């Protein structure tokens, strides 16, 4: 297997999943020249710009080839100086006194995976907004207030004591899949396949 | 100051410069939403989908207030420098694993003199579209990398990353503005984020 492969995701994806494996990719296949691009949806995809894509979506009826990679959860959660000067929401409908942080688009992410009283999906009034997962992390981190975001984007931090997790008898236990979605004629190529080889194993 | 304020940049400026600082302007100013998105180059500026863009870059009608100079570091995590040692001059780069941009090409063009005081260029092994990305790619032994300043100190600060070819790297530095069209500038809340922008990044 040798020459380049570009492979289009979200940031958090590239950076907390991607980056971390590429160096053990790199010892078992030298010659293949990974390409990592962030953008957004499945633009680049469809028109053919990269060669497979890594996203939490579900096409279906496309035509293109889907991929199992792994299932997440997602997590609500704040710092631990943001808790300590604003409290800690012992409900979800205390969600409405605090800063909550969320997407510019796409809005739907902006009902979170946190159930009210009556049991369904708080829907948010965004006090900051941006446009990547990876940026609400970021003010997560610096104090800024409460996100909802994917484990696998903040597990890492809740470990370090970095993040607390929230109203976690609250939080929706259901877990979103992510995919390896690529076009069947690209599947000829030995370096995708040992790619998605590599991103099964790991990842699952 | 009051309302939405739309402040777009590269991912490494908005991780490592913008949200850091994010909390402390919204103590000062708790009624200005900032909405920070990240994308390439100036078109949601020009298109007028943002307020304001920081970036390091003239459709005109546009300012640019000076936020910071930077220098470029050439680094590589020390798990990379132990199973491939470190490099002792510019030429030896050749030997090692680079890691460069897919866009724009001439960024593949470090900061690093060689022997004649020629910037080297570098053949990308691995690619990537941001310098986020590159910065990963680094810390997780991949290779070696040339990215600015704001982006890695903390890290060779705590050891993650290590600063190579010290003296054979460019002492030069590029600056970082604040953009926006001169009709936006009558906004209080775009005024006072750019003042607060000023005083705290240098
Ligand atoms: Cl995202
Ligand atoms: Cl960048």
């Given at each position: 297997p040798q020459g380049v492969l570009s492979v289009d995701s979200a940031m958090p994806m590239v950076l907390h999943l991607l980056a971390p494996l590429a160096a053990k990719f790199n010892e078992r296949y030298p010659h293949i020249r990974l390409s990592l691009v962030s953008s957004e949806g499945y633009i680049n995809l469809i028109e053919r710009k990269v060669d497979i894509a890594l996203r939490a979506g579900e096409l279906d009826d496309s035509g293109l080839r889907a991929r199992h990679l792994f299932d997440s959860r997602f997590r609500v959660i704040a710092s631990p100086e943001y808790l300590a000067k604003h409290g800690t929401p012992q409900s979800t409908e205390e969600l409405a006194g605090h800063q909550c942080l969320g997407f510019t688009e796409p809005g739907s992410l902006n009902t979170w995976a946190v159930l009210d009283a009556q049991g369904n999906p708080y829907k948010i009034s965004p006090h900051f907004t941006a446009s990547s997962g990876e940026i609400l992390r970021s003010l997560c981190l610096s104090g800024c207030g409460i996100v909802c975001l994917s484990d696998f984007l903040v597990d890492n931090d809740i470990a370090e004591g970095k993040l607390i997790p929230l109203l976690a008898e609250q939080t929706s236990d259901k877990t979103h899949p992510f995919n390896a979605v690529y076009y069947?004629?690209?599947?000829?190529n030995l370096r995708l396949r040992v790619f998605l080889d590599f991103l099964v194993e790991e990842l699952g």
């Open positions: 069947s004629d690209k599947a000829v």
